């Protein structure tokens, strides 16, 4: 399937080979996806649109803590172990990115599953899981228990390096964004610091946003797209017609950097989100999360640092806040395009935006 | 029982009725308390020594949100709900402190008690509970899954108003604060800010501080104590002789105090917290929050704020401050002398603070 | 001359009358613009290309305080009476902003204009005066004491209501934006909630950004514009040709909100920033501030709260905070188009947007 | 002179060779003491009894960055260069501790100070000064012009290794701290982790905390000290016979921390202020500032960091940590028994601590 670019939207910098997080060697991601049931909602009975996302900084193997460092555009949202991070610029274990009804039984599934891997001199180290949500409250039975430990497990054994599936996976399944379907997007840029090279690595999980305010390389492109606008039931739910018939930022680099040095990071995040025209809704959670997977930190042990730098260093860290601004607007844009119509509780239906339209657009606009 | 006033414990200010958190009009606390189980532990089989504290700020009723803030004096630890109290001023529903392998339990129980007990119109509202943690490892199969839905929905539904127990339960059950036993604690402070009287009422679950630290009244009186030292198998594991034969602040008050103002409320916890000693562990999650039960939040609605407090007013802020001083202080006293000896996991066994050695100290420095 | 309106720029939104920071009732604005001087620079002697922007939150006759709120971007710089803003949600006096080598000079000076115009009882509130930067350094002598006393008596004085001077004037009279000539900016917004309107007004003392990454309405246009690359004595200094022949935000708003509002405004002002391309250099001071115009303080008095305003009452808090975003982004460009094209220090030459070229571009993408 | 130490006060840990902040290695300490006039105060006449004290992180020809990090305990009150801080983890130049009016006056005149000193590449790292304030509005004439330019540079100059002197001096010259002399105190602590041992250095400028809530050493002591309440005109001016006849804290370390792990040693301050009983005022600016003399970073060069700590590592982080209260707690008594009776004015009178009164208290304590 296409992504931004094969549809002609241009953007700036230099993607990574996969262009995805995982271009940030060592990063595993995996994703379980449950979608069961149509039609009305019952609580407790679905229609389920709903999963987890895993990612593992240093590969699902890995003891060892990430240097590492947060920001928040709308704290309006829950993200576990970030004030352990805010603390001791660390953490250990997978970020798992979710929905918000499944956020505890996630965070007790990681601990079940680290007893059946962990030596247990170790799990210590594993009682701070790190679980963040959006809400999949139009496409899913969000309270109804539909995802189980099976489904978690499944995620965090079967997490993987190469090429990330994108759109309506894992965390990302039953998400909306700007009117459009949600889900999971990811982007990487490869950056020049003099006489080295880095790369950043960014994954979303998008469930923010109205479709007016949309920009895509610079368009305001909910105007001029036709049609699309989300259904319940057969009766269009939003836009003009209506009546008739939260975000998650994950940073990966490999660049050294130092806590705090990550929180800068983490801060360049909502520029790339401001380039795209939304406006950080009031009860949308918008967060982001830096690591560095060369500056490790051995569990016990002394923190390996292999090389540093210096804040005041503009060269080496403009090109990695414009790594980071670059590949969070890219990531984006991907999320829209990777996710397909879907229907889901109450018989709701949120539209893909339509590549058709977008690729004809981008052709008039940038000739 | 005797509290700690009632072994001879000289504090300052003017207690309210109870010298409770439940002193603030309409807070309900409950307990539930789980112990079962003796010798070696075997994760998932025991012996358990854990359990769960609720706090509901407005009662178990209530739908509204409550004004609050928060502070952190060591960050190593969870506590959900703080992104949104630190972007939006308020949280939703109960409090929960509980032991560290507990929390993602906790908080799905939570999620289920209201989906039986609030309108699904309010439901949206119950999706981001607040529930924190310090950690049981030394007397409890922390991993084991001793804690069950029911165990929680016990203490939701039993919470009430006036005494509140202290000592080994719920969410203190296991804990060990200083070398002796930890657990629950509380305190409350009537103060008057000019010719208005707020009360100041304090919470803490205890689990943090070394015995060579302690403070109590200005004593450093962990020498003066003889013996007490914890053992296992019948052999001292601490101390001097060894060999031989986190914590968490809720602060509650009916000032009518703005979110910000409520953020300095919770920071002064760390200076009640210092007067006893201990000096932040690094890996001690320390943690407050502060909320009022007189500036709350119609659910959806206008705010209800009932009179309005200058923070450059001296006279009453610095009440409410020393207010939250001393009711800290005390707390934290006051859970030592309810915590009593106890034997659990691996036959690790932590003395409660002998009440005849302390009260025969503070005679001979206090007449 | 013509605002970016004016040269066919499009912008979303409905501004106030003045599309100015003045269009909030009651805020005053005053410059003093100091020029002297041409050639080579010696420190102590000029060339001088410095001043000095003075905003009086409620006149500059008040004597009460102000709800107050900040956000930052990038922290490289400085501004004065923000642990204040962050402690009791108010400060007191007016806003500087000018160039780094003046801000001790501009501190005491406000100190000195305050001993003359304040009640001797009141001048305990005068003691944290409110100063900030962004560095003036290609353009002008620094470091050689070019900013007098007088000159900031005069910005205080001459202070006013209306429209307000835009371009190289005040503080922002020699700096550089997006490798164009910087300076002062402003734009507003009238926001609907339901059947209430609010304004919010936003200035930008601008210093920051790169013409490679700036974006003018969505238009990528620094490859799209010929020549105006900065020069230093006849030589091309940057750009292609090169060798050939911080940011300040202030919000204003009518918005009765408390201080944890006020920061949610600011928080969004980054957002309006990323819409135009920049990504916060290492060494780019950029910071926002919020105030409210109608949430005040009386000195040693009860606040004056008049309405009150739930922060998850979405319909008013976006179109508050989509208000920023859209005259955040004005204010950046209606700044780049007042700036006009100028000659400082060591002959340093930097031309303002070429108007005609911009024109022509925004006709182009928008027929 | 006898310091708190030789009165037969007690402290617990291990003070380094001079008890001092210039344990560690390379700091240098210089005071410029203000005192003139007597009477009645007239703004611009004096009395005067203010002043500056400088701290020189690497010493006074250092072009060259510290790594840092801050805490506030309470933020009414002013420090320049914290942003900086906060952003880069670093600041350049020395620190200055000064009274409220002095605060421009320091600022701009460590820049013109730099002008002389610093090489022309070098003066960009020269535009943040870091100075800070706390108030000496009983004693001196604030706004009156009392400190110059003059006096700045000769604290600057002047400054040196050795023995640190405390009590009435420098910027502490007009303070009152406990309703007791205020002024600068100083305490150092050698600390054990593991093989190696690290010195942590504190200096404090007290003018906080009301004398009912001082403790020293544990003994609340303000009701056991007969007289040496303060007096205007030869009247007591507070305490019961009334009417008859802010806190800075800098420390300093050799542990090679990273700026967020001495963020931590800067949020330890308010434990060791704890121990002393104030409960900080709501108009008392107290803030704590931590920088490490091993974790370096040469201007525009590489950071140097000579080894790395881990922040789960409890035995060397716990032993700075202990380090920094016991430092801090004994550096405010310091400040109490170096500071001697003073009348400014006003002809307001505040004692020293009384000597006798107190090493009488301690031997009855401390048999
Ligand atoms: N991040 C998920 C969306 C969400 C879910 C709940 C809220 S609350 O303020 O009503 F608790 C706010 C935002
Ligand atoms: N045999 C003991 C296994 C074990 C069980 C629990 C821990 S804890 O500190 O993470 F609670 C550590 C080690
Ligand atoms: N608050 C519970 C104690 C605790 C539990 C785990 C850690 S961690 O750094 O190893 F993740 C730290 C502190
Ligand atoms: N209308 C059916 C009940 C209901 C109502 C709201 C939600 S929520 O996901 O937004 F919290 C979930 C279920
Ligand atoms: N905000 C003005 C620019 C500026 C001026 C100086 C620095 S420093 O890191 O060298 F202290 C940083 C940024
Ligand atoms: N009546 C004396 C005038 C005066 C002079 C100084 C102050 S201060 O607290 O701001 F330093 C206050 C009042
Ligand atoms: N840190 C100095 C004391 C101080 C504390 C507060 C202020 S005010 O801005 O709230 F009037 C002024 C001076
Ligand atoms: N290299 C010439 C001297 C000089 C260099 C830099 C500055 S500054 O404004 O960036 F601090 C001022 C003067």
Request: proline residues 5%.
């Amino acid at each position: 399937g296409p992504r931004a670019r094969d549809l002609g939207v241009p953007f700036e910098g230099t993607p990574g080979a996969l262009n995805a997080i995982t271009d940030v060697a060592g990063v595993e991601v995996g994703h379980t996806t449950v979608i069961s049931g149509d039609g009305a909602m019952v609580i407790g009975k679905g229609p389920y649109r709903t999963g987890v996302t895993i990612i593992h900084p240093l590969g699902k193997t890995s003891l060892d803590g990430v240097a590492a460092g947060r920001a928040v555009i709308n704290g309006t949202g829950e993200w576990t172990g970030m004030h352990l991070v805010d603390e001791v610029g660390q953490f250990l274990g997978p970020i798992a990115l979710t929905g918000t009804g499944n956020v505890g039984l996630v965070h007790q599934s990681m601990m079940d599953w680290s007893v059946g891997k962990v030596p247990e001199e170790a799990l210590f180290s594993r009682l701070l899981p790190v679980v963040a949500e959006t809400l999949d409250n139009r496409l899913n039975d969000v309270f109804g228990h539909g995802l189980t430990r099976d489904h978690v497990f499944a995620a965090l054994d079967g997490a993987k390096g190469g090429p990330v599936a994108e759109g309506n996976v894992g965390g990302g399944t039953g998400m909306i964004a700007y009117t459009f379907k949600g889900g999971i997007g990811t982007s990487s840029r490869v950056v020049s610091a003099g006489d080295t090279r880095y790369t950043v690595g960014v994954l979303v999980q998008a469930n923010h946003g109205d479709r007016n305010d949309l920009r895509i390389a610079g368009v305001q492109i909910g105007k001029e797209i036709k049609g699309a606008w989300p259904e319940v039931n057969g009766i269009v739910a939003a836009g003009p017609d209506a009546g008739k018939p939260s975000l998650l930022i994950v940073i990966a680099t490999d660049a050294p950097l130092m806590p705090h040095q990550l929180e800068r990071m983490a801060r360049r995040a909502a520029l790339g989100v401001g380039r795209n025209g939304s406006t950080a809704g009031a009860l949308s959670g918008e967060f982001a999360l830096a690591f560095s997977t060369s500056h490790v930190i051995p569990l016990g042990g002394k923190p390996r640092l292999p090389a540093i730098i210096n804040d005041t260093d503009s060269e080496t860290m403009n090109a990695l806040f414009r790594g980071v601004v670059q590949a969070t607007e890219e990531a984006l844009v991907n999320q829209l395009v990777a996710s397909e119509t879907m229907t889901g509780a109450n018989n709701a239906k949120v539209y893909g935006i339509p590549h058709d339209q977008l690729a004809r657009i981008m052709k008039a606009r940038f000739p």
